[PDB]
Write an enzyme that holds these catalytic residues in place. Structure first.
Site, PDB file in Angstrom:
ATOM      1  N   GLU A  62      25.378 -35.666 -41.949  1.00 48.66           N
ATOM      2  CA  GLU A  62      25.520 -36.904 -41.393  1.00 48.66           C
ATOM      3  C   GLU A  62      25.728 -38.195 -42.489  1.00 48.66           C
ATOM      4  O   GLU A  62      25.440 -37.860 -43.564  1.00 48.66           O
ATOM      5  CB  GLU A  62      24.089 -37.338 -40.856  1.00 48.66           C
ATOM      6  CG  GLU A  62      23.100 -38.053 -41.777  1.00 48.66           C
ATOM      7  CD  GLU A  62      21.896 -38.604 -41.030  1.00 48.66           C
ATOM      8  OE1 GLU A  62      21.088 -39.290 -41.435  1.00 48.66           O
ATOM      9  OE2 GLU A  62      21.600 -38.301 -39.821  1.00 48.66           O
TER      10      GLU A  62
ATOM     11  N   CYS B 224      39.774 -25.540 -32.593  1.00 52.09           N
ATOM     12  CA  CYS B 224      40.941 -25.890 -32.747  1.00 52.09           C
ATOM     13  C   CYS B 224      41.820 -26.757 -31.653  1.00 52.09           C
ATOM     14  O   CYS B 224      42.848 -27.230 -31.624  1.00 52.09           O
ATOM     15  CB  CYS B 224      41.840 -24.731 -32.889  1.00 52.09           C
ATOM     16  SG  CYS B 224      41.474 -23.648 -34.275  1.00 52.09           S
TER      17      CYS B 224
END
Ligand SMILES: C/C=C/C/C=C/CCC(=O)[C@@H](O)CC(N)=O
Ligand SMILES: C/C=C/C/C=C/CCC(=O)[C@@H](O)CC(N)=O
Ligand SMILES: [Mn+2]
Ligand SMILES: [Mn+2]
Lengths: 334, 334
Positions: B104, B130
């Site tokens: 984060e 992907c």
């Protein structure tokens, strides 16, 4: 032709089902301190920072090696039952947790495989620190509003066990500095748990709570982020409340419940005071469950539902300040 | 009242800007093999699996310790210039990369801070192996179509340097098994690079390529996934093509370009043969850049644009098979 705040709100999105999982194992701050005591003494710290400062009396952990996907799956099964629908109806499943099984595939795909979703089910993860469940609700809502799907799952499972294990080892090291010790204390405010929500087109679920949507403001200039963090967090929340006024028509005194992400007792106190919010309208589980990251908001909402006090028509504010910095505020009408 | 496939397509979403970054450093498979040779010999393997089997002659790496956010930022600056707009116009920035700076905040928030987005800019990461750039385009498109925002950035920066460093060490270990050696070879098909796209409401950018949207099918029953992977991947792509027929009206022979995510030369060959696709309509950068994960599709599209062969009206298929398993197919009309 003329924009109005209300135009961007969702008119046909509802909450069909909601569930949470309480992690089973109670780890009290009393028990944690007994292990920290020698390092507390050695450091000369008389302060029970956990209980008296952060204001956490206990947090829940898993009893076993629960993966985020396992916890999310368990919550999702429960939410489907709450909505009284089968998995075959789900057209989208979004996972929003900070906890993550693997780099790939998505945690969402794993949960979806566990549940047995159909080949039409779209899946992906959204990552946005403590605000991601609200983001996921909004992303699902936009598909529902358009009619692309009829039902969606938003799920979030969190596990802090490993963080606790590693943290407790570093903090009880003979050579740990008071600084490092302080910097690591914050991990001991985290807790485990899970939540899931089934959202649906309103015509399929008349009389279900309605999700109106909401607003986001950001202060990415502070993505590096102390007293400064609280200050900047509050300033951002102030601007987000203005946006909420402009879109949702929010006035603090007209909201019935505030479901707020919590960082610590004092952070929450400062937020509530800054905005004149009535503490009695702020359910808090932090003291006994700690901070469950992006699952905190839906877990609190779920706990409010099962307590049975909510009335049809109640206006429920969902909000939090996340790393970024970001702030999101959204409304559910029960 | 009566659904039609075309109803869910976006009518008012365009591609205002597109850019890619080529990572600067050429690492040839010849050079890599020179380092693997002793372990190749020791193992008794005569096969140049990289060049002759996977079909990769080189891949690009960064010269320095580039973070995903740095690469995405560089691509985004270039895409803004391509769209001839300032950052102040951006209402949403989504990051879709596999590579990640930190747990984060979101990589998107970091890129946004670097660029200097306004406080109205919504940001988050989408993770879906992907296929995530296509997911990000669709999520942005739904906000644009609704009129919630006027411009969006979708960004993706990938770095494999550390993967290469760690991998090359494990594969040149005196005690490495042929199995482990094989299992790790696949990391050596990855490459570095970045891409960014500015999407906009069509009325703001007349004559820009149009993004129609697309379809997704999943086979999450195979989230564990060999020859089996190729088989199941193709079966899923077959069902996704059916969905594309039903929504986009796709017939293979009527598409002008196919921009396809690539796993290896033989995987691509099998896919192309299975669906009767004309190889001349499939631009490939895999041989010299390797597999750039979710950035592969927009990088290839960007490279097609700058080569200047695309004509107004060309129908461009964007597609890939991702871990999950998932398959997504979407259309851009130039
Ligand atoms: C009221 C002031 C809040 C300051 C913000 C702190 C960041 C909080 C956290 O670090 C996590 O709890 C959740 C998050 N950052 O998204
Ligand atoms: C044509 C057959 C394809 C088989 C699928 C393989 C998975 C590919 C990868 O592992 C990455 O390249 C991208 C991904 N999995 O999302
Ligand atoms: Mn126990
Ligand atoms: Mn170089």
């Amino acid at each position: 032709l003329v924009p109005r705040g209300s135009h961007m709100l969702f008119q046909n999105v509802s909450i069909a089902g909601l569930a949470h999982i309480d992690a089973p194992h109670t780890l009290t701050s009393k028990e944690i301190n007994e292990r920290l005591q020698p390092t507390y003494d050695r450091l000369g710290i008389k302060t029970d920072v956990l209980g008296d400062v952060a204001g956490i009396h206990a947090r829940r952990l898993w009893d076993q090696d629960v993966q985020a996907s396992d916890a999310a799956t368990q919550a999702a099964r429960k939410a489907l039952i709450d909505a009284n629908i089968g998995i075959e109806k789900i057209g989208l499943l979004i996972n929003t947790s900070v906890s993550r099984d693997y780099l790939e595939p998505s945690t969402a795909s794993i949960v979806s495989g566990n549940l047995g979703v159909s080949d039409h089910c779209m899946t992906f993860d959204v990552a946005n620190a403590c605000l991601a469940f609200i983001n996921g609700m909004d992303i699902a809502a936009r598909m529902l509003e358009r009619g692309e799907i009829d039902y969606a799952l938003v799920v979030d499972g969190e596990t802090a066990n490993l963080v606790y294990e590693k943290t407790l080892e570093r903090m009880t090291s003979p050579d740990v500095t008071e600084e490092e010790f302080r910097n690591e204390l914050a991990a001991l405010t985290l807790g485990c748990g899970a939540a899931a929500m089934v959202m649906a087109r309103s015509e399929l679920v008349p009389d279900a709570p309605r999700y109106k949507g909401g607003v986001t403001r950001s202060a990415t200039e502070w993505n590096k982020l102390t007293r400064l963090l609280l200050i900047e967090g509050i300033k951002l929340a102030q601007k987000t409340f203005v946006a909420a006024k402009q879109v949702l028509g929010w006035a603090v005194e007209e909201l019935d419940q505030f479901v707020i992400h919590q960082v610590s007792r004092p952070h929450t106190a400062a937020f509530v005071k800054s905005f004149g919010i009535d503490p009695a309208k702020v359910m808090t589980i932090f003291g006994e469950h700690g901070n469950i990251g992006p699952a905190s908001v839906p877990i609190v909402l779920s706990k409010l539902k099962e307590l049975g006090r909510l009335k049809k028509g109640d206006r429920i504010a969902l909000l939090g300040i996340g790393s970024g910095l970001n702030c999101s505020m959204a409304e559910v009408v029960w």
